[PDB]
Amino acid sequence: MSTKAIYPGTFDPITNGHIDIITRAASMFDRVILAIAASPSKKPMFDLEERVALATTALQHLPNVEVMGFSDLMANFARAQQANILIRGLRAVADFEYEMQLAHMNRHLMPELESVFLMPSKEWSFISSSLVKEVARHAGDVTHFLPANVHQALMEKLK
Amino acid sequence: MASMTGGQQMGRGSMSTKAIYPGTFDPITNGHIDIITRAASMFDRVILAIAASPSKKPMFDLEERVALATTALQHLPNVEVMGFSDLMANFARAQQANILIRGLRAVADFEYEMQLAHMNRHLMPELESVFLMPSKEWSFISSSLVKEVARHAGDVTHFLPANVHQALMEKLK
């Protein structure tokens, strides 16, 4: 019957690469929550409210997607939301190791939650939030990597 | 609204899913059974696609591979087992599949996996590759390793379903 997936992240801010991942996931699962980490250990450029607002606008056109902040154990959030799937984008070899480690822990914490991995499109295969910010901080053109609403929000933050 | 549109795959909610999980499965292990059990839990239908003519000559022929797997997975109602002798993207297309299951064991594989996924996007845009990590229990096993342990009389009963374990013992006298 139903599939409900969580796509967790800091999304600081959401990029076209994230948008690609969640568009693909929302085509394969009945519902998807974009789960935005409230309190990441490194303080974000955008607070949770901004991160959530930006992502909501960017994903508004996807009918079975909902954007939410969260501040607890992912196992507890997924359990609270009755999710049975966890989506991760998988850009780098470095990230794979870490994600396999969290997956195993998540299996221990919540056996009924299956973790699922998608590779990024070749177009978005080298972009991250961090990189786009760095480029944009020194006036590089990043219009290709962000939706308009996010782009304007980033420009404002750097002025 | 059929007389206006047949419908697109993207941006319109959830769609019927049919996945293929290709491999040589020579023979199918508990690791393989775990991957397909997981995928079968999240997708409507799953086809275990067994490669007819792998580059390295397999210990079990296609017929044996297909029979063992069919038995091992018969308790999963939405799974079927087929041989195939094509590109995995062509088989997917023939089979009207939209999902490609890949197990992701090792870091050494990841680059290769990404590259094959880019090739498959190029060959069949509508086919989505989906990656599952193996359970910690099966993380270090492979058909090849189980065969080589078994050849020299190591105990591999933990790693295989019973039908396969028996077939394997027969192959090794």
From Swiss-Prot, chain B:
Cofactor: Mg(2+)
Pfam families: CTP_transf_like
UniProt-annotated location(s): Cytoplasm
MF terms in GO: ATP binding; pantetheine-phosphate adenylyltransferase activity
Bilayer-spanning residue ranges: none
Principal place of residence: cytoplasm
The protein's Enzyme Commission number: 2.7.7.3
Binding-site list for ATP: 24-25, 32, 103-105, 113, 138-144
Function: Reversibly transfers an adenylyl group from ATP to 4'-phosphopantetheine, yielding dephospho-CoA (dPCoA) and pyrophosphate.
Complex and partners: Homohexamer.
Name the record gives this protein: Phosphopantetheine adenylyltransferase
Origin species: Enterobacter sp. (strain 638)
